[PDB]
Design a protein around this ligand. Structure first.
Ligand SMILES: Cc1cccc(-c2cccc(C(=O)O)c2)c1
Length: 242
Protein backbone atom coordinates (compact mmCIF):
# COMPACT_ATOMS: atom_id res chain seq x y z
CA UNK A 1 0.00 0.00 0.00
CA UNK A 2 2.85 2.41 0.75
CA UNK A 3 6.20 2.40 -1.01
CA UNK A 4 9.23 4.48 -0.08
CA UNK A 5 11.55 5.63 -2.89
CA UNK A 6 14.54 7.39 -1.36
CA UNK A 7 15.96 8.17 -4.79
CA UNK A 8 13.40 10.98 -5.02
CA UNK A 9 15.46 12.75 -2.33
CA UNK A 10 17.68 13.96 -5.18
CA UNK A 11 14.90 16.34 -6.25
CA UNK A 12 15.39 18.13 -2.93
CA UNK A 13 19.11 17.73 -2.22
CA UNK A 14 20.04 19.09 -5.67
CA UNK A 15 18.49 22.37 -4.45
CA UNK A 16 20.34 22.24 -1.13
CA UNK A 17 16.96 21.54 0.51
CA UNK A 18 15.08 18.76 2.31
CA UNK A 19 11.42 17.75 2.07
CA UNK A 20 8.79 15.12 1.34
CA UNK A 21 6.52 14.42 -1.59
CA UNK A 22 3.56 12.11 -1.08
CA UNK A 23 1.63 10.75 -4.09
CA UNK A 24 -1.60 8.72 -4.07
CA UNK A 25 -2.85 6.75 -7.12
CA UNK A 26 -6.60 6.81 -6.70
CA UNK A 27 -7.37 3.97 -9.16
CA UNK A 28 -4.80 1.63 -7.58
CA UNK A 29 -5.24 2.85 -3.97
CA UNK A 30 -1.45 3.00 -3.57
CA UNK A 31 0.76 5.67 -2.03
CA UNK A 32 4.35 6.68 -2.76
CA UNK A 33 6.79 8.89 -0.89
CA UNK A 34 10.51 9.67 -0.54
CA UNK A 35 10.37 9.75 3.27
CA UNK A 36 7.79 7.78 5.23
CA UNK A 37 8.76 9.44 8.52
CA UNK A 38 8.40 13.01 7.28
CA UNK A 39 5.23 12.10 5.38
CA UNK A 40 3.64 11.55 8.82
CA UNK A 41 5.22 14.49 10.70
CA UNK A 42 2.78 17.26 11.52
CA UNK A 43 3.39 20.89 10.53
CA UNK A 44 1.39 24.08 10.68
CA UNK A 45 -0.93 24.07 7.63
CA UNK A 46 -0.55 27.83 7.05
CA UNK A 47 -2.34 28.90 3.85
CA UNK A 48 -3.28 25.30 2.92
CA UNK A 49 -5.83 25.96 5.69
CA UNK A 50 -7.62 28.21 3.23
CA UNK A 51 -9.22 25.00 1.81
CA UNK A 52 -11.13 23.99 5.00
CA UNK A 53 -11.66 27.63 5.96
CA UNK A 54 -13.38 28.31 2.60
CA UNK A 55 -15.55 25.20 2.97
CA UNK A 56 -16.75 26.21 6.40
CA UNK A 57 -17.33 29.86 5.48
CA UNK A 58 -19.46 28.81 2.47
CA UNK A 59 -21.43 26.16 4.29
CA UNK A 60 -22.36 28.50 7.14
CA UNK A 61 -23.25 31.40 4.85
CA UNK A 62 -20.31 33.57 5.94
CA UNK A 63 -19.49 33.60 2.21
CA UNK A 64 -22.51 33.65 -0.09
CA UNK A 65 -20.75 32.54 -3.29
CA UNK A 66 -17.51 32.86 -5.29
CA UNK A 67 -18.50 36.30 -6.62
CA UNK A 68 -19.09 38.07 -3.28
CA UNK A 69 -16.59 40.91 -2.95
CA UNK A 70 -14.52 41.26 0.22
CA UNK A 71 -13.57 44.92 0.30
CA UNK A 72 -10.00 45.92 1.17
CA UNK A 73 -9.96 47.39 4.69
CA UNK A 74 -7.66 50.21 3.54
CA UNK A 75 -4.66 49.10 5.61
CA UNK A 76 -1.56 49.04 3.45
CA UNK A 77 0.16 45.66 3.79
CA UNK A 78 3.51 44.59 2.42
CA UNK A 79 2.01 42.23 -0.21
CA UNK A 80 0.75 44.50 -2.99
CA UNK A 81 -1.89 42.03 -4.25
CA UNK A 82 -3.52 42.10 -0.81
CA UNK A 83 -4.21 45.86 -1.03
CA UNK A 84 -7.30 45.42 -3.15
CA UNK A 85 -10.78 43.94 -3.25
CA UNK A 86 -11.07 40.16 -3.58
CA UNK A 87 -13.62 37.44 -4.14
CA UNK A 88 -13.15 33.83 -3.04
CA UNK A 89 -11.31 32.94 -6.29
CA UNK A 90 -8.73 35.74 -6.15
CA UNK A 91 -8.39 35.45 -2.37
CA UNK A 92 -7.37 31.80 -2.80
CA UNK A 93 -5.12 32.65 -5.76
CA UNK A 94 -3.17 35.40 -3.90
CA UNK A 95 -3.37 33.64 -0.49
CA UNK A 96 -4.95 36.74 1.04
CA UNK A 97 -4.54 36.10 4.76
CA UNK A 98 -6.52 39.15 5.98
CA UNK A 99 -9.69 38.07 4.09
CA UNK A 100 -9.48 34.60 5.66
CA UNK A 101 -8.78 36.07 9.12
CA UNK A 102 -12.15 37.85 8.92
CA UNK A 103 -13.84 34.59 7.75
CA UNK A 104 -12.47 32.85 10.87
CA UNK A 105 -13.75 35.61 13.18
CA UNK A 106 -17.26 35.27 11.72
CA UNK A 107 -17.13 31.46 11.93
CA UNK A 108 -16.10 31.70 15.58
CA UNK A 109 -14.24 29.20 17.76
CA UNK A 110 -17.07 26.81 18.54
CA UNK A 111 -18.18 26.26 14.94
CA UNK A 112 -14.59 26.13 13.62
CA UNK A 113 -13.62 23.47 16.15
CA UNK A 114 -16.74 21.42 15.46
CA UNK A 115 -16.23 21.50 11.69
CA UNK A 116 -12.56 20.55 11.78
CA UNK A 117 -13.51 17.57 13.91
CA UNK A 118 -16.23 16.68 11.38
CA UNK A 119 -13.55 16.88 8.65
CA UNK A 120 -11.07 14.71 10.63
CA UNK A 121 -8.63 17.54 9.77
CA UNK A 122 -5.11 17.07 11.17
CA UNK A 123 -4.97 17.25 14.93
CA UNK A 124 -8.30 19.19 14.85
CA UNK A 125 -6.86 21.60 17.46
CA UNK A 126 -7.61 25.30 17.09
CA UNK A 127 -5.81 26.43 20.27
CA UNK A 128 -4.46 29.94 19.76
CA UNK A 129 -6.14 33.03 18.37
CA UNK A 130 -9.21 32.35 16.27
CA UNK A 131 -7.89 34.67 13.56
CA UNK A 132 -4.38 33.17 13.35
CA UNK A 133 -4.24 29.64 14.78
CA UNK A 134 -3.31 28.14 11.38
CA UNK A 135 -0.30 30.48 11.29
CA UNK A 136 0.90 30.34 14.90
CA UNK A 137 -1.52 28.27 17.00
CA UNK A 138 -1.69 24.60 17.87
CA UNK A 139 -3.19 23.11 14.71
CA UNK A 140 -0.99 20.62 12.85
CA UNK A 141 -1.35 18.33 9.85
CA UNK A 142 0.90 15.87 7.99
CA UNK A 143 1.30 15.35 4.27
CA UNK A 144 -0.52 11.99 4.48
CA UNK A 145 -3.33 13.64 6.45
CA UNK A 146 -3.58 16.30 3.73
CA UNK A 147 -4.12 13.49 1.18
CA UNK A 148 -6.86 11.94 3.32
CA UNK A 149 -8.71 15.26 3.61
CA UNK A 150 -8.34 16.07 -0.09
CA UNK A 151 -9.66 12.67 -1.16
CA UNK A 152 -12.87 13.33 0.77
CA UNK A 153 -13.17 16.75 -0.89
CA UNK A 154 -12.63 15.30 -4.37
CA UNK A 155 -15.39 12.73 -3.74
CA UNK A 156 -17.79 15.30 -2.12
CA UNK A 157 -17.72 13.24 1.10
CA UNK A 158 -16.98 15.99 3.57
CA UNK A 159 -19.80 16.91 5.98
CA UNK A 160 -20.74 20.12 4.17
CA UNK A 161 -23.00 20.53 1.15
CA UNK A 162 -22.05 19.35 -2.34
CA UNK A 163 -22.29 23.00 -3.49
CA UNK A 164 -19.74 24.18 -0.92
CA UNK A 165 -17.30 21.45 -2.06
CA UNK A 166 -17.78 22.22 -5.76
CA UNK A 167 -17.16 25.93 -5.14
CA UNK A 168 -13.93 25.31 -3.23
CA UNK A 169 -12.68 22.91 -5.89
CA UNK A 170 -13.37 25.61 -8.47
CA UNK A 171 -11.34 28.07 -6.36
CA UNK A 172 -8.45 25.57 -6.14
CA UNK A 173 -8.06 25.50 -9.94
CA UNK A 174 -4.36 26.19 -10.62
CA UNK A 175 -3.48 24.86 -14.08
CA UNK A 176 -5.29 23.20 -16.97
CA UNK A 177 -4.31 22.10 -20.50
CA UNK A 178 -5.06 19.31 -22.94
CA UNK A 179 -3.09 16.83 -20.78
CA UNK A 180 -4.08 17.44 -17.16
CA UNK A 181 -5.80 19.64 -14.61
CA UNK A 182 -4.24 20.63 -11.27
CA UNK A 183 -6.39 21.73 -8.34
CA UNK A 184 -4.18 22.72 -5.39
CA UNK A 185 -3.22 25.25 -2.71
CA UNK A 186 0.22 26.52 -1.64
CA UNK A 187 1.30 27.22 1.91
CA UNK A 188 4.19 29.10 3.53
CA UNK A 189 4.77 28.71 7.29
CA UNK A 190 7.28 31.07 8.97
CA UNK A 191 6.04 31.83 12.51
CA UNK A 192 6.97 28.49 14.06
CA UNK A 193 10.09 26.46 13.39
CA UNK A 194 10.89 24.79 11.09
CA UNK A 195 9.89 27.17 8.34
CA UNK A 196 8.33 25.23 5.43
CA UNK A 197 6.52 25.58 2.15
CA UNK A 198 3.60 23.35 1.18
CA UNK A 199 1.84 22.41 -2.02
CA UNK A 200 -1.19 20.11 -1.75
CA UNK A 201 -3.86 19.07 -4.27
CA UNK A 202 -4.36 16.65 -7.13
CA UNK A 203 -3.85 16.02 -10.83
CA UNK A 204 -6.90 15.03 -12.90
CA UNK A 205 -6.21 12.82 -15.91
CA UNK A 206 -8.70 11.38 -18.39
CA UNK A 207 -8.98 8.08 -16.48
CA UNK A 208 -7.32 8.53 -13.03
CA UNK A 209 -6.59 11.07 -10.30
CA UNK A 210 -3.26 11.46 -8.51
CA UNK A 211 -3.37 13.24 -5.15
CA UNK A 212 -0.24 14.95 -3.86
CA UNK A 213 1.06 16.67 -0.78
CA UNK A 214 4.54 18.06 -0.37
CA UNK A 215 6.38 20.15 2.16
CA UNK A 216 9.97 21.37 2.17
CA UNK A 217 12.29 23.44 4.27
CA UNK A 218 11.99 27.13 3.37
CA UNK A 219 14.65 29.15 5.26
CA UNK A 220 13.91 32.20 3.04
CA UNK A 221 11.20 33.24 0.62
CA UNK A 222 13.66 32.89 -2.29
CA UNK A 223 12.85 29.17 -2.62
CA UNK A 224 9.06 29.40 -2.76
CA UNK A 225 8.92 28.54 -6.47
CA UNK A 226 10.53 25.18 -5.72
CA UNK A 227 7.31 23.98 -4.09
CA UNK A 228 5.60 23.56 -7.47
CA UNK A 229 8.79 22.99 -9.49
CA UNK A 230 9.95 19.98 -7.51
CA UNK A 231 6.44 18.50 -7.36
CA UNK A 232 6.04 18.78 -11.12
CA UNK A 233 9.50 17.21 -11.59
CA UNK A 234 8.43 14.21 -9.53
CA UNK A 235 5.18 14.00 -11.50
CA UNK A 236 7.12 14.05 -14.78
CA UNK A 237 9.59 11.42 -13.54
CA UNK A 238 6.67 9.16 -12.61
CA UNK A 239 5.01 9.63 -16.05
CA UNK A 240 1.95 11.24 -14.49
CA UNK A 241 2.40 14.38 -16.61
CA UNK A 242 4.50 14.84 -19.75
C1 LIG B 1 7.64 36.83 1.23
C2 LIG B 1 6.23 36.47 1.64
C3 LIG B 1 5.80 36.64 2.95
C4 LIG B 1 4.52 36.31 3.32
C5 LIG B 1 3.63 35.81 2.39
C6 LIG B 1 4.01 35.65 1.06
C7 LIG B 1 3.03 35.22 0.03
C8 LIG B 1 1.88 35.97 -0.22
C9 LIG B 1 0.99 35.59 -1.21
C10 LIG B 1 1.22 34.45 -1.96
C11 LIG B 1 2.35 33.68 -1.72
C12 LIG B 1 2.57 32.41 -2.50
O1 LIG B 1 3.63 31.79 -2.28
O2 LIG B 1 1.66 32.04 -3.30
C13 LIG B 1 3.25 34.08 -0.74
C14 LIG B 1 5.32 35.97 0.71
Amino acid sequence: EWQENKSWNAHFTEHKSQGVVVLWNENKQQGFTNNLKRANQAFLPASTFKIPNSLIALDLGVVKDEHQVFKWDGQTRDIATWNRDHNLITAMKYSVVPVYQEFARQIGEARMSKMLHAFDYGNEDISGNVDSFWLDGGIRISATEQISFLRKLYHNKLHVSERSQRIVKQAMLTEANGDYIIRAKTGYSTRIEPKIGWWVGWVELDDNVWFFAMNMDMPTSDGLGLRQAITKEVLKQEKIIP
